[PDB]
Design a protein around this ligand. Structure first.
Ligand SMILES: Cn1cncc1CN(CCN(CC1CCN(C(=O)OC(C)(C)C)CC1)S(=O)(=O)c1ccccc1-c1cccc(CCC(=O)O)c1)c1ccc(C#N)cc1
Ligand SMILES: CC(C)=CCC/C(C)=C/CC/C(C)=C/COP(=O)(O)OP(=O)(O)O
Ligand SMILES: [Zn+2]
Lengths: 407, 323
């Protein structure tokens, strides 16, 4: 009908989704109200300016931002000087989602840089001459798999990688993030991700690890960084994704987890918060919404007959609207929420989340929902590794040719 | 000595006491990627850090240098590692170092490295006596700081400092009853002290939570805590809960109350209650109300729940196809 608004966030009923603070004000509600008011202004801008809304992913602008960043960054990025393989991964993955090819000159330079970051005793550090750490190790492996050439695959010293992983393994099934470092669920994910991609998983590498992760699921249904801690989207993604790799998702209460994540989508903003009673943030478009494909697969593997065969169990439309309307910087790049500045991390995860929200797939069944102009459609991403599913298959196939180190 | 932000800070390449050392430029290769155009101050500190790291020079001057490298990039875990090597190797006073870490955490409280460093120091000293008051000051500025809560749990658990924490939780719940980190701490404290199997404790917690819900019916944290502490034994185990929630319907309703009702019904059906079908239809009605009107952001979840309940609890569910 003509009176009908096709955008969910702009419908008249949507205003009923604004925060009800029960006339009891606290820091939490004051902060939430501020965000909602800012977001409402964005939603309303079309109507106040008397224009018809047009949701356009600014691809050319994002590409220019990325293409440049891959080469050179301002000193705004000094705080990421121990995380340079993350920068490689975020940028290459964003480019991959936007279906922009990686010049072979670029590919080889990235390979060579990551070689310099690799420790003689296994794993990758944040930069040349830095000690190894599971976080940049994960990023480096993803980045090399995105490139996906013989040269890239060959960078990874698999024997040393496995030795490095063992040196971090704790008796209780957990892993240190690095030597002398801290333990949390991120490390289980980082180790499982690189070990599965490169085919170095031995019989006992992950002994006790599934059980350790399960101890991090708490009374909320989500997963905390360590046993006892508040549930958080980032840690919940690491936990579930690692269990999926280990084929041990059933170690978790999947139903309380499903209930928890779906509750993290914000009824007004459309995006996701990282934990209960905190603020929406575009990067959770991946960390939180990425759980839904993982849960779908796990539940489906149990023969759940009630599963949709065309949508994930979150509001795909509302998430796209949040990202497209609220998270794009006009000059290129994406961001956390309106008012925040662009950066490569949010550019990666906002686009990853957009792809997830666009593409449903469960075995043979496929269904896309693309809000705004059709050119908005991104390439799909693998919900476990967050690189293209084609890159996952190609890497695993290549490394399965090799023997697990030690045989 | 010379603070990184001192008006009279001087570059290391200009310091007489560093003249014997050749700085080590970063090895980025012939054609760099993600190359950061560092400020002069940053590149100068890190060129000298590379030099002392490479030489493994364990000196007072190297120790002081790590303080500047950390201030420039507190996420540089390599610098933190070398600083800890120097602490032990130089036999530095660890309480002085505690003074240092408390200051850096105050300025950069969201960084992982600073909290791990503090933990190591506490472990080395076997002294937790400053911890709870220090953390409380951080939480007074950001009551949801995740590392702060994590460090607090670690300290309490490792040193058995349980006695005053429920009192602390109650104070913070008064300041902001919506603070989810504080509801989590409540559960952490009770779980590890009395447990929730103690009927007087459970009863006390449920009464407390219901009282909070009445004060702030749209506060999701109280709702998740009520569900959290009741659900492992199974919501249907508590027959009065349902009627008492329905009594809040009139003037304390929310999508949270409605959703909780569905959770109760789901568990009732799971444990084969009286009036199977009556309960089912009540549940299915609520799922539709939620999906279509009261909680549409979660329409896919609520329709999945509706389908799930239908599929396994309808009168036709166990009936053979031939019938
Ligand atoms: C405010 N905010 C909202 N979203 C992101 C942020 C900040 N984050 C850091 C995000 N990660 C997790 C939390 C977020 C909130 N906290 C925070 O704002 O701390 C400061 C940045 C102010 C110090 C605490 C950190 S994250 O860097 O821990 C992270 C997120 C996602 C993927 C990876 C990582 C990460 C990966 C490898 C190493 C680390 C190392 C830091 C460490 O463990 O020592 C972190 C961030 C990270 C990178 C970029 C870029 N480009 C922009 C932002
Ligand atoms: C693979 C890998 C490294 C995964 C980690 C992903 C991730 C997002 C972890 C977040 C951990 C954390 C300390 C969150 C708190 O930040 P905050 O409280 O300032 O932000 P918030 O308000 O949204 O919780
Ligand atoms: Zn973010």
């Amino acid at each position: 009908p003509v009176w009908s608004e096709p955008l969910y966030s702009l419908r008249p009923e949507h205003a009923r989704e604004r925060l009800q603070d029960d006339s009891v004000e606290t820091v939490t509600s004051i902060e939430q109200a501020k965000v909602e008011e800012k977001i409402q202004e964005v939603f309303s801008s079309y109507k106040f300016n008397h224009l018809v809304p047009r949701l356009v992913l600014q691809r050319e602008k994002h590409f220019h931002y990325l293409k440049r960043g891959l080469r050179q960054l301002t000193d705004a990025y000094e705080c990421l000087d121990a995380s340079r393989p993350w920068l490689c991964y975020w940028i290459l993955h964003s480019l991959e989602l936007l279906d922009e090819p990686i010049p072979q000159i670029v590919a080889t330079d990235v390979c060579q840089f990551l070689e310099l970051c690799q420790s003689p005793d296994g794993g990758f550090g944040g930069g040349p001459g830095q000690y190894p750490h599971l976080a940049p190790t994960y990023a480096a492996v993803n980045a090399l798999c995105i490139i996906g050439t013989e040269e890239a695959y060959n960078v990874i010293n698999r024997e040393k990688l496995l030795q490095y992983l063992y040196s971090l393994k704790q008796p209780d099934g957990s892993f240190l993030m690095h030597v002398g470092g801290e333990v949390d669920v991120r490390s289980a994910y980082c180790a499982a991700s690189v070990a599965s991609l490169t085919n170095i998983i031995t019989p006992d590498l992950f002994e006790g690890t599934a059980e350790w992760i399960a101890r991090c699921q708490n009374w909320e249904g989500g997963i905390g960084g360590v046993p006892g801690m508040e549930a958080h989207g980032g840690y919940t993604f690491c936990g579930l994704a690692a269990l999926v790799i280990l084929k041990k998702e059933r170690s978790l209460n999947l139903k309380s987890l499903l209930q928890w994540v779906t509750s993290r989508q914000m009824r007004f903003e459309g995006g996701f918060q990282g934990r209960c009673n905190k603020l929406v943030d575009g990067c959770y478009s991946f960390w939180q919404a990425g759980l839904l494909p993982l849960l779908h697969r796990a539940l489906h593997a149990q023969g759940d007959p009630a599963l949709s065969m065309s949508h994930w169990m979150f509001h795909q439309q509302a998430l796209q609207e949040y990202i497209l309307m609220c998270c794009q910087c006009p000059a290129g790049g994406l961001l956390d929420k309106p008012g925040k500045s662009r950066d490569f991390y949010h550019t990666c995860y906002c686009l990853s989340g957009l792809s997830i929200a666009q593409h449903f797939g469960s075995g043979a069944m496929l269904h896309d929902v693309v809000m705004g102009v059709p050119e908005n459609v991104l390439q799909p991403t693998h919900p476990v590794y967050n690189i293209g599913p084609d890159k996952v298959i190609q890497a695993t196939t290549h490394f399965l040719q090799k023997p697990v180190p030690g045989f | 000595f010379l603070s990184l932000d001192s008006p009279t800070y001087v570059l290391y390449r200009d310091r007489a006491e560093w003249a014997d050392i050749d700085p080590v430029p970063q090895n980025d290769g012939p054609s760099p990627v993600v190359q950061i155009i560092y400020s002069e101050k940053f590149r100068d500190v890190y060129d000298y850090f590379r030099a002392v790291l490479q030489r493994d020079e364990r000196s007072e001057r190297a120790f002081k240098l790590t303080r500047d490298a950390i201030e420039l990039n507190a996420a540089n875990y390599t610098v933190w590692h070398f600083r800890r090597v120097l602490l032990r190797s130089l036999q530095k006073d660890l309480q002085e170092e505690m003074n240092y870490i408390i200051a850096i955490i105050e300025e950069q409280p969201k960084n992982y490295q600073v909290w791990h460093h503090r933990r190591v120091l506490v472990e080395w000293l076997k002294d937790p006596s400053q911890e709870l008051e220090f953390i409380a000051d951080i939480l007074n500025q950001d009551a949801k700081n995740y590392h702060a809560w994590q460090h607090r749990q670690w300290v309490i658990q490792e040193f058995r400092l349980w006695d005053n924490e429920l009192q602390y939780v109650d104070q913070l719940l008064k300041e902001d009853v919506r603070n989810n980190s504080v509801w989590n701490q409540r559960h952490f404290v009770i779980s590890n002290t009395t447990g929730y199997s103690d009927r007087a404790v459970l009863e006390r917690e449920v009464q407390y939570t219901l009282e909070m819900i009445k004060l702030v019916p749209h506060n999701e944290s109280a709702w998740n805590y009520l569900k959290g502490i009741l659900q492992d034994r199974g919501l249907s185990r508590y027959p009065n809960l349902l009627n008492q929630l329905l009594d809040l319907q009139p003037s304390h309703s929310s999508p949270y109350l409605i959703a909780f009702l569905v959770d109760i019904y789901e568990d009732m059906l799971e444990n084969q209650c009286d009036n199977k079908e009556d309960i089912l239809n009540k549940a299915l009605e609520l799922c539709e109300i939620l999906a279509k009107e009261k909680d549409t952001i979660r329409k896919e979840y609520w329709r999945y729940i509706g389908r799930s309940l239908q599929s396994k609890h309808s009168r036709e569910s166990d009936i053979p196809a031939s019938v």
